Short mmCIF file of C-alpha atoms and ligand atoms in Angstrom, two decimals:
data_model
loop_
_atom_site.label_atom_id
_atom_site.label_comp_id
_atom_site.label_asym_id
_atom_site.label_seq_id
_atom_site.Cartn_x
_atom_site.Cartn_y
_atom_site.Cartn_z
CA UNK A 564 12.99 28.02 -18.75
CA UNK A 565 12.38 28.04 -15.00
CA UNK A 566 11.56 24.23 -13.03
CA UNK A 567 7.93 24.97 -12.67
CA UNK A 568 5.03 23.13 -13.86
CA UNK A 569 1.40 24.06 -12.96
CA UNK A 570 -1.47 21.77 -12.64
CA UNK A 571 -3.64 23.48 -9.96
CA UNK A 572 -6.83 23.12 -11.65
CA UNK A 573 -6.51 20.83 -14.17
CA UNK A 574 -9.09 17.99 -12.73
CA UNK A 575 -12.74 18.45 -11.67
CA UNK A 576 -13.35 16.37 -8.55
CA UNK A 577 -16.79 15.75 -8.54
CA UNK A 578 -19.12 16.30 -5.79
CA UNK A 579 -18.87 13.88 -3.41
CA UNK A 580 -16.05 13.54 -1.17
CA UNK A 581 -14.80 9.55 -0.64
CA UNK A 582 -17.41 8.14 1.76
CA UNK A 583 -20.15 9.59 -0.18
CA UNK A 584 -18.71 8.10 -3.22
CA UNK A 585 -19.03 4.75 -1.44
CA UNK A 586 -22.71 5.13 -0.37
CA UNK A 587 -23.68 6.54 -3.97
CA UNK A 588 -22.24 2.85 -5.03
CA UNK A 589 -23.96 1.40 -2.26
CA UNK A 590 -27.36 2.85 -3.06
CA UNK A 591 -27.09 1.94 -6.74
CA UNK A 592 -25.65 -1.48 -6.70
CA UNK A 593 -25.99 -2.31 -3.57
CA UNK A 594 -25.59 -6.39 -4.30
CA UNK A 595 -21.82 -5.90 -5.73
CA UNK A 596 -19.10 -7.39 -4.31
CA UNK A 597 -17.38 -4.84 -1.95
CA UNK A 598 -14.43 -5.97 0.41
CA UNK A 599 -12.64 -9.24 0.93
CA UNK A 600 -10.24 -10.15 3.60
CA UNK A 601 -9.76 -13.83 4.01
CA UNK A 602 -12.94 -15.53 4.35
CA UNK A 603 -15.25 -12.35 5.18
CA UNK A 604 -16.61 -11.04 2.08
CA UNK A 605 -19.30 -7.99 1.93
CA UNK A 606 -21.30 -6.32 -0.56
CA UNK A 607 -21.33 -2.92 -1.13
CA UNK A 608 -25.17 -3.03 0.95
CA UNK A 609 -23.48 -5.25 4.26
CA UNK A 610 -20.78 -3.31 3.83
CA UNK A 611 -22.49 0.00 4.26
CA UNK A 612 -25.14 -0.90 6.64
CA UNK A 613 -22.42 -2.50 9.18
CA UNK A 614 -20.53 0.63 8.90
CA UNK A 615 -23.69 2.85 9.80
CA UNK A 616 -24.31 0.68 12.59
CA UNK A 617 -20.71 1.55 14.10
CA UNK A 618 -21.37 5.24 13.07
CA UNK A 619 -24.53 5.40 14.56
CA UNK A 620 -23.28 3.63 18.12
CA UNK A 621 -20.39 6.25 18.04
CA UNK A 622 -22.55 9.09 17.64
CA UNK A 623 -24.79 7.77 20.71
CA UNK A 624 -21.49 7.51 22.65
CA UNK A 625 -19.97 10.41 21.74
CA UNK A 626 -22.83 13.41 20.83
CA UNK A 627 -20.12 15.69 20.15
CA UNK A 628 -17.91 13.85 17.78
CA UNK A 629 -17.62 15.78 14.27
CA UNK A 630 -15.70 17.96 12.28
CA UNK A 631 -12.01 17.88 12.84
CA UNK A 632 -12.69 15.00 16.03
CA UNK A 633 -10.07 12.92 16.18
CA UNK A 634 -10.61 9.29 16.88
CA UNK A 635 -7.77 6.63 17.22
CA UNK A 636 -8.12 3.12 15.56
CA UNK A 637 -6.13 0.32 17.18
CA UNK A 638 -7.39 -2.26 15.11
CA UNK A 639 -5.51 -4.60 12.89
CA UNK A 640 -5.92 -4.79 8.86
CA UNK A 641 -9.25 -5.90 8.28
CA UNK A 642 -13.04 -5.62 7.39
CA UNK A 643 -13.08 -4.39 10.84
CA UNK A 644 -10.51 -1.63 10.13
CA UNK A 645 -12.27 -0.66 7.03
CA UNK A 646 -15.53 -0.32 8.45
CA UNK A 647 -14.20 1.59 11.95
CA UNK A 648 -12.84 3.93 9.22
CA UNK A 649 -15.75 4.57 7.05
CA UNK A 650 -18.13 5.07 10.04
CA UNK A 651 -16.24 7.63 11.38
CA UNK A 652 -15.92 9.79 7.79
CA UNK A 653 -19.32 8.62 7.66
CA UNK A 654 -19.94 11.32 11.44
CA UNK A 655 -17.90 13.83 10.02
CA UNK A 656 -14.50 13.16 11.90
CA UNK A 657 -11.04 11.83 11.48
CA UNK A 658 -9.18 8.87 12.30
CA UNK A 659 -4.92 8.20 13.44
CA UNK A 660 -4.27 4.77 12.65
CA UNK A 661 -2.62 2.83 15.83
CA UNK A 662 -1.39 -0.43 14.85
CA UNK A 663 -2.40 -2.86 17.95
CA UNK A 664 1.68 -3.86 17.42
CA UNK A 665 2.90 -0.49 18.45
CA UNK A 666 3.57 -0.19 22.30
CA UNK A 667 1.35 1.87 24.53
CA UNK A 668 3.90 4.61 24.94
CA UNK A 669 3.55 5.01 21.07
CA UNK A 670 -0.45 5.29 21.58
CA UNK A 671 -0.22 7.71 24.07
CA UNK A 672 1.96 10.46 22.11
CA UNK A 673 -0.16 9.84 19.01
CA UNK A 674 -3.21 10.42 21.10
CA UNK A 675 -1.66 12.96 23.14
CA UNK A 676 -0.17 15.20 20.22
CA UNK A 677 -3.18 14.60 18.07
CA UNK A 678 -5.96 15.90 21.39
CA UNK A 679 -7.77 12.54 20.36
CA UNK A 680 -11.70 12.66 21.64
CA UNK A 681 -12.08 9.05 21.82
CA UNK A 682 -10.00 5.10 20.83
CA UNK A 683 -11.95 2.29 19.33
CA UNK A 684 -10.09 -0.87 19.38
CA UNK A 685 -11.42 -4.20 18.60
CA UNK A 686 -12.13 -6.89 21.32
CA UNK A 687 -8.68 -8.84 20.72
CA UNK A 688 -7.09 -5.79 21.75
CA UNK A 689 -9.59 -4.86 24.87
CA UNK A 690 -8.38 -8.00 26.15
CA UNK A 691 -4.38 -7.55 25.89
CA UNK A 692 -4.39 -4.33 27.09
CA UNK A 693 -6.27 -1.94 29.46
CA UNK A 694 -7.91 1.28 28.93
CA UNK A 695 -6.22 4.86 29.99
CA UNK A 696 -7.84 6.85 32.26
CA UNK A 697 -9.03 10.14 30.33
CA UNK A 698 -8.66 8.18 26.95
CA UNK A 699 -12.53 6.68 26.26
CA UNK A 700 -12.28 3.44 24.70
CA UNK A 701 -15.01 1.64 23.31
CA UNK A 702 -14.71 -1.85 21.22
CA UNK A 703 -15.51 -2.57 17.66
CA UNK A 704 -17.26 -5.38 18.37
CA UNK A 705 -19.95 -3.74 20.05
CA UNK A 706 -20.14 -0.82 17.84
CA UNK A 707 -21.10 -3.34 14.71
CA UNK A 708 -23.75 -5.50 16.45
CA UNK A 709 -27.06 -6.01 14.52
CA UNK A 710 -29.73 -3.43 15.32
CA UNK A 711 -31.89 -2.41 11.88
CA UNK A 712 -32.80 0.98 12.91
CA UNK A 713 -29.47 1.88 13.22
CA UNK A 714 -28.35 1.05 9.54
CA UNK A 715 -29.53 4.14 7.52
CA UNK A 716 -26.39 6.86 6.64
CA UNK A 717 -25.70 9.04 9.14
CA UNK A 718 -25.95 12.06 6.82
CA UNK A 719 -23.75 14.21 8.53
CA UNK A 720 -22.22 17.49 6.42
CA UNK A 721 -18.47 16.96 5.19
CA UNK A 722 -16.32 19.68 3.63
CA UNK A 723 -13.45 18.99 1.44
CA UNK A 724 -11.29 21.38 4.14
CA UNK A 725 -11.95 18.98 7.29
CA UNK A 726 -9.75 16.38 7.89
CA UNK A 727 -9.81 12.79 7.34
CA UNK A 728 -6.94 11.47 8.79
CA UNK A 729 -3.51 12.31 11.02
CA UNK A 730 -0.93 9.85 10.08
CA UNK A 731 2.08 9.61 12.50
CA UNK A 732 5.73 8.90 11.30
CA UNK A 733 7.13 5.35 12.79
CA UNK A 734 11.16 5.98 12.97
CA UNK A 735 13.38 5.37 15.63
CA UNK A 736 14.16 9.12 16.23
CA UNK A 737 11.91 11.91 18.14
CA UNK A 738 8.52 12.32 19.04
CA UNK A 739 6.23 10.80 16.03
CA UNK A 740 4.77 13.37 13.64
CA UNK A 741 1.53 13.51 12.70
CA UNK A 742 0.51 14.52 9.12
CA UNK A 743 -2.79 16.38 9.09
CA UNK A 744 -4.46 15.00 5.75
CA UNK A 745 -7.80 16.79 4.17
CA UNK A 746 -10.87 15.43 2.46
CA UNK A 747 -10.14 16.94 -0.51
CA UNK A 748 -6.59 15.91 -0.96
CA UNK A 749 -6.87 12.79 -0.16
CA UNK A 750 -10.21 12.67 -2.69
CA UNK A 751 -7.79 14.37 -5.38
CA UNK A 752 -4.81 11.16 -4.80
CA UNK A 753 -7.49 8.71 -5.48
CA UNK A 754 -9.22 10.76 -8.52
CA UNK A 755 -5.68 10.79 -10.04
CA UNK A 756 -5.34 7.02 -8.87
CA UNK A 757 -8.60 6.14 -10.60
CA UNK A 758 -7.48 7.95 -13.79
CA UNK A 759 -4.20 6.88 -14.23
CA UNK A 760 -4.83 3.16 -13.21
CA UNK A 761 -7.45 2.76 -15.62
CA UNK A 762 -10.26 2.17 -12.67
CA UNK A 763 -13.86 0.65 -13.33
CA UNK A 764 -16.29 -0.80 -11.82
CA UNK A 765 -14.64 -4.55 -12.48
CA UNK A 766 -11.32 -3.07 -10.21
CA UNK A 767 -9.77 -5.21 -7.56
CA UNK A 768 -7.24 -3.62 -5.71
CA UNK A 769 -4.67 -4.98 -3.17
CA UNK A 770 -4.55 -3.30 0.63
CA UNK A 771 -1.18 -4.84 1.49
CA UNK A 772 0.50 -2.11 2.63
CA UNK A 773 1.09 -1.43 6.50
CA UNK A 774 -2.16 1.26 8.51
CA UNK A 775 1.10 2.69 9.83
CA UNK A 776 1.32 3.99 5.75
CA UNK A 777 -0.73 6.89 4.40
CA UNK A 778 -0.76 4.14 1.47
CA UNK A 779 -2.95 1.84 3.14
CA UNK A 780 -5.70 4.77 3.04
CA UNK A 781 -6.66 4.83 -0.82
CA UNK A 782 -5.76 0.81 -1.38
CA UNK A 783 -8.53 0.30 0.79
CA UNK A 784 -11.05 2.88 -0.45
CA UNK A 785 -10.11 3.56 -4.14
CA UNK A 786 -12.16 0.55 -5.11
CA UNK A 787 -15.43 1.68 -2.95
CA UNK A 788 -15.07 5.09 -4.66
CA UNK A 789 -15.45 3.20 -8.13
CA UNK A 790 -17.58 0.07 -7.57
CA UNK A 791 -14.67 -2.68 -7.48
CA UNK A 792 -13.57 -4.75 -4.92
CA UNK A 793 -10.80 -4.15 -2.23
CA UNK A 794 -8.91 -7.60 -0.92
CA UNK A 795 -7.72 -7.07 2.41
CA UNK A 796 -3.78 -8.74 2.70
CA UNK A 797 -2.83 -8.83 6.27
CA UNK A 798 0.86 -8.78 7.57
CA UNK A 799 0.41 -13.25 7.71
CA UNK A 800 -0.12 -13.26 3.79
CA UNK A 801 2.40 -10.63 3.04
CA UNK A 802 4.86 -12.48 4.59
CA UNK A 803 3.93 -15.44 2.62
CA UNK A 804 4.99 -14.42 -1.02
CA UNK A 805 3.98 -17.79 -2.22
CA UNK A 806 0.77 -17.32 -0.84
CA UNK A 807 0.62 -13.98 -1.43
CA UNK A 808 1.27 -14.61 -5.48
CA UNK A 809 -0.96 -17.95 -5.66
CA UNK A 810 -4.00 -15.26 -3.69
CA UNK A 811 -3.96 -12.40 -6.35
CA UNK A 812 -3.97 -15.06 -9.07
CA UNK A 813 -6.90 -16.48 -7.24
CA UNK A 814 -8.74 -13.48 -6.75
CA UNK A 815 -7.68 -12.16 -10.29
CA UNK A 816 -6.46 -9.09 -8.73
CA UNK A 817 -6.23 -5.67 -11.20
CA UNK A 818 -4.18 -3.54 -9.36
CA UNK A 819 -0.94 -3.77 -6.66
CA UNK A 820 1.31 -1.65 -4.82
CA UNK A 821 4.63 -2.44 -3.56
CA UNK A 822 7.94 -0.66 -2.46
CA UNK A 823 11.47 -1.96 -4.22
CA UNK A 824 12.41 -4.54 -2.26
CA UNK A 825 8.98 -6.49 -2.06
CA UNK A 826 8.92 -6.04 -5.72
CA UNK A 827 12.13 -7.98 -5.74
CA UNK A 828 10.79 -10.75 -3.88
CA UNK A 829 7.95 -11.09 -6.15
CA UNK A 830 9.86 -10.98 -8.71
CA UNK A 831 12.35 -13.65 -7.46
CA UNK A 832 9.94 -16.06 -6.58
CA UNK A 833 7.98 -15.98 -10.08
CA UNK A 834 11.39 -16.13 -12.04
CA UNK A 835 12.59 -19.40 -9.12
CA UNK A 836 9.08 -21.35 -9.30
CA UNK A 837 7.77 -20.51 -13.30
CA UNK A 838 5.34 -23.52 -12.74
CA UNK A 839 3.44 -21.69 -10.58
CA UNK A 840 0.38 -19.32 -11.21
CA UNK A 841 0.64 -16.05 -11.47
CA UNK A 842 -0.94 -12.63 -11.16
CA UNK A 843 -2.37 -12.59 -14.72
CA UNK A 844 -5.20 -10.20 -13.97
CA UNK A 845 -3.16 -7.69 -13.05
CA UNK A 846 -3.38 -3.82 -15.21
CA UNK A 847 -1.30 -1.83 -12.92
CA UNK A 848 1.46 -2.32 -10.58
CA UNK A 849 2.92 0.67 -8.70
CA UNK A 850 6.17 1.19 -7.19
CA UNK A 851 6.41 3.54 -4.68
CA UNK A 852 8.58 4.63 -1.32
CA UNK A 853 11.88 4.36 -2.23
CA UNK A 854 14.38 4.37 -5.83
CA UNK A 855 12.97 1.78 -7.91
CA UNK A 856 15.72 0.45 -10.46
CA UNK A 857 15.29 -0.03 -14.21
CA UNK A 858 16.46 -3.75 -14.21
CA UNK A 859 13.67 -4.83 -12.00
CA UNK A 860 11.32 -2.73 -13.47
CA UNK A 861 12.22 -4.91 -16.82
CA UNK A 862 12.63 -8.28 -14.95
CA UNK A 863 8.46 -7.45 -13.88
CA UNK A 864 7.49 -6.54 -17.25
CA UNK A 865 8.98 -10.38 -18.47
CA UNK A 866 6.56 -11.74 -16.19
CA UNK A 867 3.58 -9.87 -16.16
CA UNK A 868 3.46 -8.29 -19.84
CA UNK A 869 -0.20 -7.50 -19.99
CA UNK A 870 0.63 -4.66 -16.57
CA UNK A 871 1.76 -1.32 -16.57
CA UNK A 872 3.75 0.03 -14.19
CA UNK A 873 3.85 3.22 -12.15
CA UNK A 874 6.86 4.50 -10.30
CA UNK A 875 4.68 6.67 -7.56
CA UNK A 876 6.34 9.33 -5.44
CA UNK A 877 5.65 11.99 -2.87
CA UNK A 878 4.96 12.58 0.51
CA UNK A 879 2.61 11.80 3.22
CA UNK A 880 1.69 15.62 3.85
CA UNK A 881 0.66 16.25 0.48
CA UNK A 882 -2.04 13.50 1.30
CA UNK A 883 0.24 10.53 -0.67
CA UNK A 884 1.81 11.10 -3.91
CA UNK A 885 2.28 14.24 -6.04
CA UNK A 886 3.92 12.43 -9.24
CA UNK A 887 3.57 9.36 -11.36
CA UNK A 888 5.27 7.74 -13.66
CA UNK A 889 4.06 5.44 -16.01
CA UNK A 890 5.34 2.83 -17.97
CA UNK A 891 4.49 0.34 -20.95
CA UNK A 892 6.53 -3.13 -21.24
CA UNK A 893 8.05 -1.37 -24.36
CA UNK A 894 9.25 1.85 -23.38
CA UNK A 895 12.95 2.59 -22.65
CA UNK A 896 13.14 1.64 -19.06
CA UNK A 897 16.73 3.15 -18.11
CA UNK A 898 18.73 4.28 -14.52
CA UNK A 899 17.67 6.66 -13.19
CA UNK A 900 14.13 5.69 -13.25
CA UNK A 901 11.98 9.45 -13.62
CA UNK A 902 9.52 10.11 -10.88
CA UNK A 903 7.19 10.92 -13.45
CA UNK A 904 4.78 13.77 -14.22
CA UNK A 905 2.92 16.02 -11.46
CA UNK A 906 -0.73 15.10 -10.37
CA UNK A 907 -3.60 16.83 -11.41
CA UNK A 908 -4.05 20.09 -9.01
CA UNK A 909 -0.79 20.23 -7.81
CA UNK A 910 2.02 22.72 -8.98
CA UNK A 911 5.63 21.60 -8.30
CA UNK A 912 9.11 23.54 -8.55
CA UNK A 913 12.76 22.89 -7.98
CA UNK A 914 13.44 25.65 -6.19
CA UNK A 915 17.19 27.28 -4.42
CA UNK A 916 16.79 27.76 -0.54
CA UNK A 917 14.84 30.57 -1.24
CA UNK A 918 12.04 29.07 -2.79
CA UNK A 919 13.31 30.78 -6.34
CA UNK A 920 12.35 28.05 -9.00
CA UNK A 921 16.15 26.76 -10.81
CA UNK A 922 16.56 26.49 -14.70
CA UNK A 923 15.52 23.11 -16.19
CA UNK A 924 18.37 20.52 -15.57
CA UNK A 925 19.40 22.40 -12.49
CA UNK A 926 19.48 20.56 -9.30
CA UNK A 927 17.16 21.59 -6.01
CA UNK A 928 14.98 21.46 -3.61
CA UNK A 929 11.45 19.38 -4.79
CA UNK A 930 8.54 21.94 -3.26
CA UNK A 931 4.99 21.35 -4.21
CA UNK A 932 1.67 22.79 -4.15
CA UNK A 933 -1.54 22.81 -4.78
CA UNK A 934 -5.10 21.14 -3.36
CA UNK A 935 -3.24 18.18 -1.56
CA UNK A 936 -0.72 19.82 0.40
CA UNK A 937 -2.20 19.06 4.23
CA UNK A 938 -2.19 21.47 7.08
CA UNK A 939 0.64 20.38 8.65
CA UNK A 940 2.01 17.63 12.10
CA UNK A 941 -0.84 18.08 14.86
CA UNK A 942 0.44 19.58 18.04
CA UNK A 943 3.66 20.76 16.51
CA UNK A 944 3.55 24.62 14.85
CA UNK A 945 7.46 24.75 15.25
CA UNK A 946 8.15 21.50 13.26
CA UNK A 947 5.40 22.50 10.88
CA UNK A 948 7.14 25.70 10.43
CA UNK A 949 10.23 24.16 9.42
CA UNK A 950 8.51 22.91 6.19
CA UNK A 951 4.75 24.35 5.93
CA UNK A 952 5.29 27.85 4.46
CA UNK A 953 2.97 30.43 2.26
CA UNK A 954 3.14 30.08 -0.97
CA UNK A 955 5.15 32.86 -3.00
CA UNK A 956 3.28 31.91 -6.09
CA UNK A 957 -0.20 31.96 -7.61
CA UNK A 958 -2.54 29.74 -5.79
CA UNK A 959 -6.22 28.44 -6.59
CA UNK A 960 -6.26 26.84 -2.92
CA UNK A 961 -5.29 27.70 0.26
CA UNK A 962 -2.14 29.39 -0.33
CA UNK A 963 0.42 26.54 1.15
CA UNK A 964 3.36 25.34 -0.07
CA UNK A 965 5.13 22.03 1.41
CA UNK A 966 9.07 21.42 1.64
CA UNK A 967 9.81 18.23 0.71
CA UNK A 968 13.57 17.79 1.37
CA UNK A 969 14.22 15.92 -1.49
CA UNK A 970 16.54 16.73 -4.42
CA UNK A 971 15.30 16.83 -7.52
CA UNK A 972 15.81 18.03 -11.12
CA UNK A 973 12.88 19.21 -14.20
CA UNK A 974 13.49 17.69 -17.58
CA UNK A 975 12.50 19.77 -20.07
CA UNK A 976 8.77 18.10 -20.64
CA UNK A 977 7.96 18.95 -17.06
CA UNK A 978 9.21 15.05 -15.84
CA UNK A 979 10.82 15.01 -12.54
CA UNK A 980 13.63 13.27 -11.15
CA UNK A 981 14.69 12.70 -7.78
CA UNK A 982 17.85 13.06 -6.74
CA UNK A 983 17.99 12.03 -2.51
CA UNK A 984 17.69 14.05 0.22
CA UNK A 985 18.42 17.64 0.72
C1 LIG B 1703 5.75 7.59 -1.94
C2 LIG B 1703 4.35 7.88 -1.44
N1 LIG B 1703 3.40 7.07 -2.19
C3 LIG B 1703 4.16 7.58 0.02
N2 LIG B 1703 3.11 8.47 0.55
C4 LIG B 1703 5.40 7.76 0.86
O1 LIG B 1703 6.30 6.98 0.85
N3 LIG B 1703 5.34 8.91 1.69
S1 LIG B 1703 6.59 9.23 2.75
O2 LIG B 1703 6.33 10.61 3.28
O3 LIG B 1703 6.54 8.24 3.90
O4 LIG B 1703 8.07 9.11 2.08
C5 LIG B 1703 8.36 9.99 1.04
C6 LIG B 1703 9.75 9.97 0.88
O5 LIG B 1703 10.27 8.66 0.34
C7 LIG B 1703 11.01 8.90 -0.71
N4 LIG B 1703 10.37 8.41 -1.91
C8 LIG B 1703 9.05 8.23 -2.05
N5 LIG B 1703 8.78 7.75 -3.27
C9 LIG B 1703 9.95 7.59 -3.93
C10 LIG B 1703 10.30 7.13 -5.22
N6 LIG B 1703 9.29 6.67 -6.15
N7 LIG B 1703 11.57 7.10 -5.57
C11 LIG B 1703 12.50 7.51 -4.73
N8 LIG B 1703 12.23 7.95 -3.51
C12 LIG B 1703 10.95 8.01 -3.08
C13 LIG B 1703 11.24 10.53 -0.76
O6 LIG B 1703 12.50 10.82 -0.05
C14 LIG B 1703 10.19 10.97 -0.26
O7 LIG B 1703 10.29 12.34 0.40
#
């Protein structure tokens, strides 16, 4: 047999693309607890009527903000981050997320590359740092003020093909790239998400990770899409892993995601302090970013027997992940750890330089695609080139195909493993 396994297909997405999700929750229970980030809490019906508000200032600012619009966000992790977000899906456009930590010079390219229309930043920032000439910048804090006849949904028309968000790389070589992520894929990472995590209404999922991570974009929506709760951890409580543990306990927290070495620390500190409370609550944790090690997969499952775990991989231009793997406290956790099975709607191959697909057990290169794979790094068609590329083989979608530059090997049940970079 030949490394190839096809899911393109395989999951109906429903209708409504991620912020509509959220308003059909808001219409229909509109008194549930939404978001949470310190001592701000919203229901779904604050939550959605705040974000209109925002939406509906932008669109008075801006009458020409929609489809494929980019808008910065330099705004920190917050309810204010979440709504800024939401309000502009809500007008039909797409945000970059600028952490208000990055220097200016960082802004700039990401703006520049990305022909950004407009940069909303909230008033801590207006007051650190000055606007750019040819750069509008207008300030959360005025977007979000009361008015009631701004608060119905803007009812704007999204497709699944417009984007939703450019996310730009944050290393310490080049020009940044920006990842050009659709509607639709990144609806199809949380409807795999949803499935695979065991999501209901009763969810409460963990935004820990960093804006500058395409992660941070379904921890803090999965749970609007589904009726839950997202808490809102900001870079003070992450760094606090006491704090951070005796929090998720508190807040009886269902689902987390971490990378390796955080896990680690968790994992210390429970094992170091086993007076302490824990995070009983919690279904799933997912491991994601980087090789995840069998040992500290099993040191986890001592202390939190009642999870699951999922080892998540894939990259930020196929709009987050493209497989899981999941685990049960009893299964045969081993070295190497798999990177699991492909998403729904995605077909993957290990493939020779020429994009030929290898026999099972043969090493390669990991390609994928299928309805996630994104349209490529804004302002660069030479760099998006090097690893955007028809697709050889049959296609439901749009016909692209996305070089990962990992190594990677197909078991014979269709479960990958990584093997580095290319
Ligand atoms: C992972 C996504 N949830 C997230 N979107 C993200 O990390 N995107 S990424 O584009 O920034 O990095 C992607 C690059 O990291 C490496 N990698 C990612 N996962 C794993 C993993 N489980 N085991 C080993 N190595 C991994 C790999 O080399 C890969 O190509």
């Amino acid at each position: 047999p030949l490394s190839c396994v096809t899911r393109q297909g395989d999951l109906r997405l429903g209708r409504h693309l991620v912020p509509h999700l959220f308003e059909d929750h808001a219409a229909a229970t509109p008194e549930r607890r939404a978001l949470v980030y310190n001592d701000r809490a919203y229901s779904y019906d604050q939550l959605n009527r705040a974000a209109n508000r925002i939406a509906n200032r932008l669109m008075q600012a801006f009458p020409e903000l929609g489809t494929d619009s980019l808008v910065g966000v330099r705004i920190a992790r917050s309810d204010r981050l979440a709504l800024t977000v939401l309000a502009i899906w809500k007008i039909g456009a797409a945000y970059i997320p600028i952490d208000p930590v990055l220097p200016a010079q960082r802004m700039h390219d990401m703006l520049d590359l990305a022909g950004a229309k407009a940069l909303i930043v909230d008033a801590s920032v207006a007051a650190a740092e000055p606007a750019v000439a040819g750069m509008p910048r207008i300030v959360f804090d005025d977007l979000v003020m009361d008015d009631p006849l701004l608060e119905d949904n803007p009812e704007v028309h999204l497709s699944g093909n417009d984007l939703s968000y450019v996310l730009f790389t944050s290393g310490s070589t080049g020009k940044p790239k920006g990842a050009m992520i659709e509607h639709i894929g990144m609806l199809n990472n949380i409807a795999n998400k949803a499935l695979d995590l065991a999501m209901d209404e009763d969810s409460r999922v963990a935004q820990n990770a960093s804006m500058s991570f395409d992660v941070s974009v379904w921890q803090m929506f999965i749970a609007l899409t589904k009726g839950g709760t997202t808490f809102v951890y900001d870079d003070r409580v992450v760094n606090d892993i006491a704090g951070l543990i005796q929090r998720m306990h508190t807040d009886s927290l269902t689902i987390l995601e971490v990378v390796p070495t955080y896990l680690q620390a968790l994992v210390e500190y429970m094992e170091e302090h086993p007076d302490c409370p824990r995070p009983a609550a919690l279904t799933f944790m997912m491991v994601n970013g980087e090789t995840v090690d069998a040992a500290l997969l099993k040191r986890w499952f001592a202390l939190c027997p009642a999870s699951k775990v999922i080892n998540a991989y894939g990259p930020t231009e196929a709009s987050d992940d493209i497989t899981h793997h999941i685990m049960s406290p009893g299964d045969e956790i081993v070295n190497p750890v798999p990177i699991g099975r492909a998403l729904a709607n995605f077909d993957i191959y290990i493939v020779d330089d020429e994009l030929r697909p290898v026999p099972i057990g043969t090493r390669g290169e990991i390609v994928v695609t299928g309805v996630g794979v994104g349209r490529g790094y804004v302002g660069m068609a030479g760099v998006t080139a090097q690893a955007f590329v028809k697709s050889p083989f049959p296609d439901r979608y749009k016909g692209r195909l996305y070089r990962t530059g990992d190594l990677g090997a197909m078991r014979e049940d269709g479960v990958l493993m990584f093997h580095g970079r290319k």
